[PDB]
Protein: Methyltransferase MppJ
Organism: Streptomyces hygroscopicus
Amino acid sequence: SHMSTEVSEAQARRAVADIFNSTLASSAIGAAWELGALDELRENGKLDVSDFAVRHDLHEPAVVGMFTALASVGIVRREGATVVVGPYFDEANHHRSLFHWLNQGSGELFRRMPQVLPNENRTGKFYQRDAGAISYACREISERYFDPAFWAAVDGLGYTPTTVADLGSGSGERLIQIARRFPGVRGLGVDIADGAIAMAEKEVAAKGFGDQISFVRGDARTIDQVSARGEFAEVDLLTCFMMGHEFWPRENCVQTLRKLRAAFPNVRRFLLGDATRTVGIPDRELPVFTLGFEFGHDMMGVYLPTLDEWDGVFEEGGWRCVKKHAIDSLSVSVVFELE
Amino acid sequence: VSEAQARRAVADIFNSTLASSAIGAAWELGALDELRENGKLDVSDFAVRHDLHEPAVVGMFTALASVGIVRREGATVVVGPYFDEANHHRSLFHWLNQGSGELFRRMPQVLPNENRTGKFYQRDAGAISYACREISERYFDPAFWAAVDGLGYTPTTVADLGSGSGERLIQIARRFPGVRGLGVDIADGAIAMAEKEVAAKGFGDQISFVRGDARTIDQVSARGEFAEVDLLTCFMMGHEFWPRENCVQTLRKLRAAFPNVRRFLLGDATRTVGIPDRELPVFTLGFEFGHDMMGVYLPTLDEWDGVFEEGGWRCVKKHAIDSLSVSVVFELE
Ligand SMILES: Nc1ncnc2c1ncn2[C@@H]1O[C@H](CSCC[C@H](N)C(=O)O)[C@@H](O)[C@H]1O
Ligand SMILES: Nc1ncnc2c1ncn2[C@@H]1O[C@H](CSCC[C@H](N)C(=O)O)[C@@H](O)[C@H]1O
Ligand SMILES: C[C@@H](C(=O)C(=O)O)c1ccccc1
Ligand SMILES: C[C@@H](C(=O)C(=O)O)c1ccccc1
Ligand SMILES: O=C(O)[C@H](O)Cc1ccccc1
Ligand SMILES: O=C(O)[C@H](O)Cc1ccccc1
Ligand SMILES: [Ca+2]
Ligand SMILES: [Ca+2]
Ligand SMILES: [Ca+2]
Ligand SMILES: [Ca+2]
Ligand SMILES: [Ca+2]
Ligand SMILES: [Fe+3]
Ligand SMILES: [Fe+3]
C-alpha cells in the first residue's frame, strides 16, 4: 500500500521529519556498532545511558543524542535512563555494516554531491572516502553476507588447494581463514593499495602465518605486468571478492579475465563474489544497500554490471561457470564458481 | 511488527539518508527551484544545462524518488507528494548534510572524551553559510520584520552581532535609507564576504564591519561607534553566550558596550523539552544532537526567559517562529 500521490499536510510533515531524523539514526547505527552499543543491546536487551557513557568514557549528552536518534525511527526505545531494543532493532542491527559503509565509510562522497556531479570537477582525484572505515565495514560485510556461499563453494571444490591467490586481498583475512581450514596451504594476496598490503602483512605476521602467506602490490586488471609472475604457476585456487566490478566495462573485463586465465594457468576453481547492478526495482521498493551501492558508484564514475552481464562474459574471458549462489540479500549479489 | 514491516522500515532509513543529502544538493544545483516552477523536469535536459554527469544525476533523482519527494516516469521527473514540505525545509537538509555532515559522520570519533580537546570536529563553513542565508530569510524574517515594524522608533545606527553575509544589514539599509550599519563577526571569511557584498551593492559608505567575538563584546574596538548604536540585532548565535553564568555576563557586557541601544532583537532556536522521540519535527534532533556533540550549551526558552533580568535587560515582546523546532525572537530593552 505504499505509492500514494495525494497526502495531507500533516502526513507530509511527518514523512519529511522522518526523512530528516532517519539521516541521524542512519549514522548512529554505524557509530553505535563501533562504540559497542549494538552488541550490548543485542546481548542484554536493555542498557543504562549514563552507565554506558561512563564505562566507555563517552560525552554523555552526545550519547543521549545517539540513542534518541535511533529511537526517533523505532530502532530503540527510551524509558527513563534506560534504552531497550525497539521494533526495528533486529533488522537494523543485521545490516549495521551497510549503514556504517554508507555513513562512516562513504559519507564524504554523498555529502559532496553538489561538487561531485559537475563534469568540470570529474578528473584526477575528485572525491574522498575513509579507507580505514570502509575496511572496518567490509570485514563484516564479507563475513555476514558472503561467507556462507564462499565456504559452500570451498566445500564443493573436489580437491585440496595447495596454493591460493586472492585478488584484492584487503586485510588478508580471507587468506588467513583459508590457511586455517587447509593447514599445509600457501597464500598469495594481490592488492593495488599500500595500506592494504601493509595492514595485511602485519595481520598475517601477527597471527603466525608469515611463513605461508605473502603479498604483492599490483593491479589485478593488469595482472600480467606484475613482478611476482613466477609464483603464479603453483596457484590451484583463485578467489576474488567484492571488487570484480572494477574489471568493467565489458571489453576490459573480457581481457582481464583472459589475462587471469593465462596468468594462473594451473588454477582449477576460481571463486568470484560481488554485488551487481539491479534493474527495474520500483523507486518506492528499494531494499537496503542497493541505492547506496549504485548511486555511490555512479558518483565515483565506476560502471557496475548486472548479473546477466557477468553471465555473458565468462566464455570469452576463458572461463566456464559451473555453479552460482545468490546472496541474501545484499541487493543482488552472487558467488560464481568458475573453472 | 512483522519481519516484512521491519525490512521495509530499515530500507526507508537507509534510503532516507541518501534522499536527505540529495535535498540539499538538488537545492544547490537548481533542480528544486525548477521543479517548484514547472512541476516537472527532464533528467537529460537538466544534466546538459548544468553540465553534470547524468548517471549521477539520475541517482540523485531516484534517491528523492525513493522516499516520495519526486516521482520518475522514465527521464521525466515530477513533484511527488512530499515535494512542497521538503522544498520548504530544504535549507535544513542542506545544513544537516552539506553543512554538518562531517560532524555526524565522525560520531564514533567525536563521542569519546579523550578525543574532545582542541579542534575535534569539522564542518563546512561555506556550506553552513549557504544554508544559513535561506534559514534566516525563510524562518526568521517574518518575525524579524514584525519586530522592526513595532520598534516604537526608527533606527539611526544598527549593530548586528554575527553578521555573516551582511544581508540583514543590507536589508535594513534598504528599509531605512539613512541608517548607518555595523556588523560584528568572529570569522574573517564572513567579514570578507560581507564587505564584498556591501561594496558591490552600493552600501559601502553606510555599512562597516569589524572582526570580533560577541561573547567578549567589551573587548572589541570600533572607533567609538558602539556608543552611537540605537538598534542591536543578533540572530542564530545567542546560544553561544551560554552556559548561564557566561550568558549573564555577556548580556551585561552588551548592555555596557551599547549604552544607547533602545531595542535589542535576539532571534534563535532553543532546546525543546519532552517531545516524544517518534514525534520529533524537522530539525529539532539535528540542532540539539549537533550541539551536544560539539560541546555547546543549548538553553531552553525558559532558561532564556529566566536570564534576561540578571543580564540587565527586560524582555518586552516575544514572537514564535513557524516550524523551526522551538524558535523565537525576543525584543529586549
Ligand atoms: N584493480 C585492483 N587490483 C587489485 N586490488 C584492488 C583493485 N581494485 C581494488 N582493489 C583492492 O580491493 C579491495 C576492495 S574491498 C576489500 C575487501 C576484501 N576483498 C575482503 O573480502 O574482505 C581494496 O583493498 C582495494 O585496495
Ligand atoms: N561568538 C561570536 N561572535 C561573533 N560572531 C559569531 C560568534 N559565533 C558565531 N559567529 C558568527 O555568526 C554567524 C552564525 S550564522 C548566522 C548568520 C546571520 N546572523 C544571519 O542571520 O543570517 C557566522 O557568520 C559566525 O562566524
Ligand atoms: C567494497 C565495496 C565497494 O565496491 C565500494 O565500497 O566501492 C563493496 C563491494 C561489494 C559488496 C559490498 C561492498
Ligand atoms: C547556525 C546554526 C547553529 O547553531 C550552528 O551551526 O552551530 C543555527 C542556529 C539557529 C538556528 C538555525 C541554525
Ligand atoms: O550463466 C550463469 O548463470 C553463470 O554465469 C554460471 C553458471 C552457468 C550454468 C550453470 C551454473 C552456473
Ligand atoms: O519572559 C518572556 O516571555 C520573554 O523573555 C519576553 C517577554 C516577557 C514579558 C512580556 C513579553 C515578552
Ligand atoms: Ca501508500
Ligand atoms: Ca543469464
Ligand atoms: Ca507536494
Ligand atoms: Ca542561499
Ligand atoms: Ca566601540
Ligand atoms: Fe566498488
Ligand atoms: Fe550553533
